[PDB]
Amino acid sequence: GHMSFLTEEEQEAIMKVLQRDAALKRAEEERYDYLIKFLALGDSGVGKTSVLYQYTDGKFNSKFITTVGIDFREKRVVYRASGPDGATGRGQRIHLQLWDTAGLERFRSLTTAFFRDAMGFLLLFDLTNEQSFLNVRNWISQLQMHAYAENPDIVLCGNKSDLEDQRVVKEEEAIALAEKYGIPYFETSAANGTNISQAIEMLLDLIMKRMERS
Amino acid sequence: GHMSFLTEEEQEAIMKVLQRDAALKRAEEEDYLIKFLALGDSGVGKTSVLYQYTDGKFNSKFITTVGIDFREKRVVYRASGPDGATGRGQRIHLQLWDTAGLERFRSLTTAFFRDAMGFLLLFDLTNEQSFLNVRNWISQLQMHAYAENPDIVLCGNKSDLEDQRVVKEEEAIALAEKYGIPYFETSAANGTNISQAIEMLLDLIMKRMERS
Ligand SMILES: Nc1nc2c(ncn2[C@@H]2O[C@H](COP(=O)(O)OP(=O)(O)NP(=O)(O)O)[C@@H](O)[C@H]2O)c(=O)[nH]1
Ligand SMILES: Nc1nc2c(ncn2[C@@H]2O[C@H](COP(=O)(O)OP(=O)(O)NP(=O)(O)O)[C@@H](O)[C@H]2O)c(=O)[nH]1
Numbered sequence: 001g002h003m004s005f006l007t008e009e010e011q012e013a014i015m016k017v018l019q020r021d022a023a024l025k026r027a028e029e030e031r032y033d034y035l036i037k038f039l040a041l042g043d044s045g046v047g048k049t050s051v052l053y054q055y056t057d058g059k060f061n062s063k064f065i066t067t068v069g070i071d072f073r074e075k076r077v078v079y080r081a082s083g084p085d086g087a088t089g090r091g092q093r094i095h096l097q098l099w100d101t102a103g104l105e106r107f108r109s110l111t112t113a114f115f116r117d118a119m120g121f122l123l124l125f126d127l128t129n130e131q132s133f134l135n136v137r138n139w140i141s142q143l144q145m146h147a148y149a150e151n152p153d154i155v156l157c158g159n160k161s162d163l164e165d166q167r168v169v170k171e172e173e174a175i176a177l178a179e180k181y182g183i184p185y186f187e188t189s190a191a192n193g194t195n196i197s198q199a200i201e202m203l204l205d206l207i208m209k210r211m212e213r214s
Numbered sequence: 215g216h217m218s219f220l221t222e223e224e225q226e227a228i229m230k231v232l233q234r235d236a237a238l239k240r241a242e243e244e245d246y247l248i249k250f251l252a253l254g255d256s257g258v259g260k261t262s263v264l265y266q267y268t269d270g271k272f273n274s275k276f277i278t279t280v281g282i283d284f285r286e287k288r289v290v291y292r293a294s295g296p297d298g299a300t301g302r303g304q305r306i307h308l309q310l311w312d313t314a315g316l317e318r319f320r321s322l323t324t325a326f327f328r329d330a331m332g333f334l335l336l337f338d339l340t341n342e343q344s345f346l347n348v349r350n351w352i353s354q355l356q357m358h359a360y361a362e363n364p365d366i367v368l369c370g371n372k373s374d375l376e377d378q379r380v381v382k383e384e385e386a387i388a389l390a391e392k393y394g395i396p397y398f399e400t401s402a403a404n405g406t407n408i409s410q411a412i413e414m415l416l417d418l419i420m421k422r423m424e425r426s
């Protein structure tokens with residue numbers, strides 16, 4: 001085929017997402033209790049869109065519909081602040097904005113622009129794709145270079161854990177990578193939900209314990 | 215209707231701009247970062263107007279903006295009270311976002327309204343269609359700004375080209391009144407009204423931060 005273009009259809013979609021965002025930002029000006037935003041990212045096809053659809057809906061579409069650059073979801077949830085002592089304090093009402101980024105190079109500039117709005121990052125690779133794993137180092141570098149906090153809260157997800165017959169990333173290699181950076185690691189599946197909320201609650205716990213210092 | 219994606223040279227340029235921007239914000243985290251954004255049709259003079267403001271120079275060669283860029287200036291802003299009552303000189307560190315105008319970049323440029331505390335709308339005094347597009351630009355600003363009722367200054371640029379002037383002054387002033395936005399006819403060649411227009415936008419941002 002010819003080199004795929006920017007369509008009218010697709011630029012409209014991206015501007016619809018931007019309309020929505022500007023609306024949501026203006027809403028929470030007029031002042032559930034907290035607005036926490038984080039951003040999901042990784043090689044295309046590793047499952048970032050599937051991961052968040054699982055977590056907000058509990059469903060999973062098998063058909064690959066690659067992302068048009070940028071999109072986001074929301075979820076009202078209750079956070080519980082912890083401590084060594086199981087303090088598990090009084091639940092604070094939290095209103096999440098889960099950003100979703102296209103992994104394809106042609107969206108690199110546009111997605112990277114939304115790191116300003118992120119408070120923490122959900123980095124994904126595909127347990128069935130060794131290249132996406134080796135690319136994790138570069139994604140992390142982009143995060144330190146382009147995020148708006150230094151050494152920003154990352155939580156790393158090896159996804160498609162439900163495809164064992166096709167895994168190729170050794171669990172030890174990922175544990176080691178994430179240990180080398182001090183980054184929490186979960187193997188997840190967007191199809192059956194395994195570790196989806198655990199990984200996100202983890203990210204939210206990282207972002208929440210950060211603000212509580214200042 | 216065949217918009218190419220960004221080449222890797224374009225992609226490279228915009229990423230070095232965003233690195234510049236992230237570093238700037240991070241140093242700011244460590245004495246008001248005041249941000250606004252230039253916008254308008256392509257060829258109306260956004261890059262030139264900002265370069266006249268920061269560096270006092272002007273380039274005749276058209277070099278269209280690869281998507282997004284910004285400039286900086288350090289300025290001293292003093293408030294207005296009664297009888298003048300010009301207050302203490304506050305230090306303002308202005309980030310000035312510069313956007314491509316060609317609709318091919320429209321999805322990327324609009325990603326940066328979130329950072330803009332105000333807008334500098336430009337049309338060309340010598341291009342009527344650039345002035346007629348203003349309305350669509352303002353609705354774009356209403357629909358996409360990250361605070362509602364955004365602060366805007368309007369600039370009919372290229373005022374040094376009297377012989378080429380086609381936009382009537384009545385149509386412009388009438389339009390600025392309909393929307394309650396201040397209007398300046400400017401020139402990025404000789405600096406006329408550039409400073410006055412930018413400082414005015416900075417007063418509206420300052421005065422509006424002071425109401426909270
Ligand atoms: N078996 C299985 N398939 C999965 C899993 N997660 C995603 N997939 C499949 O992998 C493909 C890619 O999923 P998708 O969520 O669109 O990936 P993406 O990270 O958003 N790619 P892009 O950045 O291009 O938008 C889809 O066909 C999806 O059904 C998983 O946990 N298990
Ligand atoms: N005489 C005169 N020429 C001007 C003035 N402002 C810009 N120009 C010229 O008209 C062209 C506009 O250039 P530029 O400032 O890049 O316009 P732009 O608004 O940034 N367009 P783009 O969105 O493509 O970046 C250039 O040739 C520039 O030299 C002005 O006030 N007077």
Ligand SMILES: C=CC(=O)Nc1ccc(S(=O)(=O)N2CCCC2)cc1
Binds near residue numbers: 117147148149
């Ligand atoms: C990269 C780490 C990080 O935490 N980034 C971030 C934090 C907060 C916000 S904000 O939306 O809450 N905002 C309004 C008030 C001032 C700042 C946006 C991005």
Ligand SMILES: C=CC(=O)Nc1ccc(S(=O)(=O)N2CCCC2)cc1
Binds near residue numbers: 152181184
């Ligand atoms: C990489 C993310 C991750 O997974 N962990 C992690 C990394 C850095 C920090 S930091 O916030 O403590 N740092 C910079 C601000 C003050 C000191 C905290 C957690």
Ligand SMILES: C=CC(=O)Nc1ccc(S(=O)(=O)N2CCCC2)cc1
Binds near residue numbers: 361365419420422423
């Ligand atoms: C006078 C009106 C006015 O200034 N509104 C306005 C102010 C600040 C910003 S911001 O983007 O720079 N901000 C949030 C994120 C970090 C800092 C945006 C719009």
Ligand SMILES: C=CC(=O)Nc1ccc(S(=O)(=O)N2CCCC2)cc1
Binds near residue numbers: 367396422
């Ligand atoms: C200069 C262009 C422009 O749009 N300026 C401007 C916009 C809004 C406000 S306002 O929000 O503070 N206002 C209206 C409602 C009550 C008080 C003030 C100035």
Ligand SMILES: [Mg+2]
Binds near residue numbers: 101
């Ligand atoms: Mg996707």
Ligand SMILES: [Mg+2]
Binds near residue numbers: 261278312
């Ligand atoms: Mg320009």
